[PDB]
Amino acid sequence: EVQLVESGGGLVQPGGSLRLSCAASGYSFTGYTMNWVRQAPGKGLEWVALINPYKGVSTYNQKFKDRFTISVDKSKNTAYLQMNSLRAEDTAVYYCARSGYYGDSDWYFDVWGQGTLVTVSSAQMTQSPSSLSASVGDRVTITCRASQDLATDVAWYQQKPGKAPKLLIYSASFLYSGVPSRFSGSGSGTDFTLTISSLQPEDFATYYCQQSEPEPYTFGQGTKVEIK
């Protein structure tokens, strides 16, 4: 059985470096070309680079030619991807995939590894639920959980599709001017709540909590309130 196993991923700060490895077994490692392919969260597949040890060739996606380095060690049956100057945009699952033999003329990816997770991040606000369905007149409750104590330094925003966000609640529980009284906020420390006591047709939108204490003033991922 032909098999590929990636490893070496992890959580790294931006500007850092990572070296992914791709170990092969069950075939002649030297003759085939090895590819790297990555997939950012919620995005499609993107080819990164290739190397064929026997031909002595390496080819990169021009998007990564300067920052990434592909290499092999035939004695270990292992290919490598050295990634430098890591950006948050490099957060993705990284796969190695086997291509064609040097004697053959068709280059499809027939054997894939399981993938290795790479996350480029500075490490705060977790919003729940991600989406919900309700009816007019319902009472809706949305929660926002912070990784650190925020006292009451939390804001809530409403954003209808194709529109700009609007301030709803400032300082955890205070109603911004012009905001209807059916909106209520509460909580302090790390758990915060937005409540819509009587849902109206104009309330179906996405709601965001926001840490206002220091930069980068993280927003929660949002809660989408849809019509049932």
Add this chain to the structure above:
Amino acid sequence: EVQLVESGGGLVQPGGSLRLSCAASGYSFTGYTMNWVRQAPGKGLEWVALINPYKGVSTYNQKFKDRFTISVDKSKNTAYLQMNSLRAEDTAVYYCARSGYYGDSDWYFDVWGQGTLVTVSSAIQMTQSPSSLSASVGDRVTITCRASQDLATDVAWYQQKPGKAPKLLIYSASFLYSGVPSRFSGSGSGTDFTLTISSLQPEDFATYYCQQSEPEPYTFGQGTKVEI
């Protein structure tokens, strides 16, 4: 009377530059902090940069600290965001937003502009349709893949079950790879390629990718999600 209006957005190629402008009116432009907030397509809000002219301080999200520059034209009551070395992931709606006056520690965005659209893209191409479809067990599924250039049966099709690694289904446009069930069929040539699943099975619910086999960068299609 407080108002913000963004302008300067547009469609540019990777590596180019844009300069967004935020025209403010109805308040003391000098005393308040102006912020830039962006929203990548179908995603949450992310704070970009801030400037307080009165305090003489500007602060950046570290993601943009050396490609983006924020500034103000006091005579125009206008803030600017110069964006250099634009990447595809900088595609977003860009808002300017007022926060607290120079003496405020809290950081709530009480006034927002309408936002301006920034698209960073090439304007070689592989377009799939549909992007997503819902079907039932036993149904027939037909996925279409369009190349913006001629490929001469150099197209592969892949299946990617959720969270798992992609698996080769069809190579060279129509040939069924070994071990692949025969209910998968591929065909087409030139710029037009089609994948058909005759009898949809419960394990076939996944995302399906076509791929340009030659030459580099071995571009994948956006993928087609097949739900139930």
